[PDB]
Structure 1
Amino acid sequence: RVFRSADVHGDSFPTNMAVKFMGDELSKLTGGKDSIKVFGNSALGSEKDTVDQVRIGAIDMARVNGASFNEIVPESLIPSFPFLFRDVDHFRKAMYGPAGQKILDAFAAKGMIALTFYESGARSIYAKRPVRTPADMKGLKVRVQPSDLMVDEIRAMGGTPTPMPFAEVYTGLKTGLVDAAENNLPSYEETKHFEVAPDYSETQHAMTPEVLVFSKKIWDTLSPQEQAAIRKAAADSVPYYQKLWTAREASAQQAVTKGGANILPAAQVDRAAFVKAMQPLWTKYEKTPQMKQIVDEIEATK
């Protein structure tokens, strides 16, 4: 069969490519038969829309950002904690290890098989002015993802958060509904947010992963062999994604700078002030002993 999968990005974006790559792998490991069609550009709805559809089995899979599960899977809050990961190497070692698996395992109770994470860089503020310190955030109308944690993060930074679907952000910035948002560089480039919010300040406040989920209702009708093939194709798509993503982070920086954007480097930003303001949120979002244990396991990963 053709499995249907959702994504907010366009057809050439690394996430879409990775899942399409996964699709090609599946079609060999099943011999021509099975495949994945990726519906890009939010065609199937917002990330939250598409998560709900996966849960009820209206669609087979979605590639979405970790924050899109924050009201559903408590463990998904964790990798979105502000300043949790020290760097890319830490993210990788922690998330592709036993602690990341515990997070993935948590989705099953909520009607989803979480197949894999993909890295998503670090998210940073961008606006019509630069931002070095929480004082600079005051008065900015900052779009965030529809997540209570992300709302609180931007408030803790000093901005006024406003939840909006990914697809609507470019227009929101144009019309002045919002004058700021936050994301990684490749997203900053792809959506052309850089043309309306040309000041990118590397606050690097979160490193939320992408998660690839499969409908448990559909999953449970498959054989163990088919299930294993699907897990295998997913795992194999990660190194492929990594090659594209590593390159895209670098090229996106070049592209946006050539197009007028000004990146304020991480060292220029008062990380300590942001960390102090945001750190209380960990305790706020540790809902269970199980969550505490995972956070501590991640912190302990060196």
Structure 2
Amino acid sequence: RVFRSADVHGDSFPTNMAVKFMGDELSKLTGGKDSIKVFGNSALGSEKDTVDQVRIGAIDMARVNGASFNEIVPESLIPSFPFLFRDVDHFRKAMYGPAGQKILDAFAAKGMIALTFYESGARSIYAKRPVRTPADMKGLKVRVQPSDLMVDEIRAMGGTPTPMPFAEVYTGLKTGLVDAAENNLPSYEETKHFEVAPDYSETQHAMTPEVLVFSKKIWDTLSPQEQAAIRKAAADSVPYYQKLWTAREASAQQAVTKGGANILPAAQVDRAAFVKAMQPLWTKYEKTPQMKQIVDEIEAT
């Protein structure tokens, strides 16, 4: 049947496109039994709300950021840890390997089947002034996702964190409720945040993944063959997503720069000042030997 899936991004965004592709692939594998419709633009609710809905079986699927599980699935904290991944190649090798699998596995006890990760580049601060160091962060009202870890990350960077839904951030910046936020370049572009917060400073403080989750209540009513079809379609969507995403990182950078944004490259940012300040959070959020082991498996990749 038609599975309903949520996304905060617009229809043309790579996450929406990848799950629509998954849906097309899935309909074939199931002899037309199944397809997916993606409701974008936060139509079904904030990310938080849609995760609640997936967990109770009110919607079938959601494509959400890892941060949105940080208070539900402890293992989801790990890939949001600051400066955990060395670069994108490290993210890919670790997150599509056994370490990433252990993180996906942890979702089942909380009513969700985590089918796949998608990469989300690196999140960086943007604002109305450049940011090279924490002193530069001091005084900024910085929107964060509603995650205790992300609140702590931005506080350690020196900003004053304020949680808000993604859809509300643009107006928050345009009207001065907040002075800053953080995200990857494609999101900075899509939302037009770059028009009102033109200084994008490559702090690259997190490389949090996206996660595609399926309601376990619904999943549990499916046959092993249907389940295997859905898992195959999700896996097959990843190289498709990666083609779109890598192109979008490049096009977003050019578009925001053409549109007046000033990107401060990572090399000019004192990752030094940010790394030593944020590291302790790893120890704070390592809540089990299992989490410690996952972090270790990631680092050893």
TM range (shorter): over 0.9
Aligned to 1:45, the other structure's residue is in SS state coil
Aligned to 1:208, the other structure's residue is in SS state coil
Aligned to 1:58, the other structure's residue is in SS state coil
- The match for 1:78 is 78
TM-superposed CA distance for 1:33, in Å, is 3.0
Distance in structure 2 (CA, Å) of the matches to 1:45 and 1:202? 30
Distance in structure 2 (CA, Å) of the matches to 1:147 and 1:175? 24
TM-superposed CA distance for 1:30, in Å, is 1.6
TM-superposed CA distance for 1:246, in Å, is 0.3
Aligned to 1:62, the other structure's residue is in SS state strand
Distance in structure 1 (CA, Å) of the matches to 2:29 and 2:100? 26
TM-superposed CA distance for 1:12, in Å, is 0.2
TM-superposed CA distance for 1:28, in Å, is 1.1
TM-superposed CA distance for 1:56, in Å, is 0.4
Distance in structure 1 (CA, Å) of the matches to 2:288 and 2:51? 23
Please list the CA deviations of residues 252-272 of structure 1 after superposition, one character each: whole Å capped at 9, or x if unmatched: 000000000000000000001
TM-superposed CA distance for 1:128, in Å, is 0.2
TM-superposed CA distance for 1:31, in Å, is 2.4
Distance in structure 2 (CA, Å) of the matches to 1:31 and 1:74? 37
- The match for 1:43 is 43
Deviates more, 1:135-144 or 1:27-36: 27-36
Between the two proteins, the alignment pairs up a number of residues equal to: 301
TM-superposed CA distance for 1:297, in Å, is 0.8
TM-superposed CA distance for 1:281, in Å, is 0.3
Please list the CA deviations of residues 107-156 of structure 1 after superposition, one character each: whole Å capped at 9, or x if unmatched: 00000000000000000000000000010000000000000000000000
Distance in structure 2 (CA, Å) of the matches to 1:237 and 1:298? 23
| Residues 1-302 of structure 1: pairs in structure 2 closer than 5 A | 1-301=1-301
TM-superposed CA distance for 1:32, in Å, is 2.8
Please list the CA deviations of residues 146-198 of structure 1 after superposition, one character each: whole Å capped at 9, or x if unmatched: 00000000000000000000000000001100010000000000000000000
Distance in structure 2 (CA, Å) of the matches to 1:27 and 1:294? 35
Aligned to 1:41, the other structure's residue is in SS state coil
Identity %: 100
TM-score by length of 2: 1.00
Distance in structure 2 (CA, Å) of the matches to 1:175 and 1:250? 29
Deviates more, 1:28-37 or 1:179-188: 28-37
Aligned to 1:235, the other structure's residue is in SS state helix
Distance in structure 2 (CA, Å) of the matches to 1:11 and 1:273? 38
Distance in structure 1 (CA, Å) of the matches to 2:85 and 2:243? 21
**Structure 1 residue runs of 4+, over 2 Å off?**
none
TM-superposed CA distance for 1:18, in Å, is 0.1
Please list the CA deviations of residues 83-105 of structure 1 after superposition, one character each: whole Å capped at 9, or x if unmatched: 00000010000000000000000
TM-superposed CA distance for 1:34, in Å, is 1.3
Please list the CA deviations of residues 208-236 of structure 1 after superposition, one character each: whole Å capped at 9, or x if unmatched: 00000000000000000000000000000
Gaps spanning 5+ residues in structure 2: where?
none
Aligned to 1:143, the other structure's residue is in SS state strand
Distance in structure 2 (CA, Å) of the matches to 1:264 and 1:34? 46
Please list the CA deviations of residues 38-57 of structure 1 after superposition, one character each: whole Å capped at 9, or x if unmatched: 00000000101000000000
Gaps spanning 5+ residues in structure 1: where?
none
Cα RMSD (Å): 0.4
Distance in structure 1 (CA, Å) of the matches to 2:31 and 2:22? 14
TM-superposed CA distance for 1:280, in Å, is 0.4
Aligned to 1:203, the other structure's residue is in SS state strand
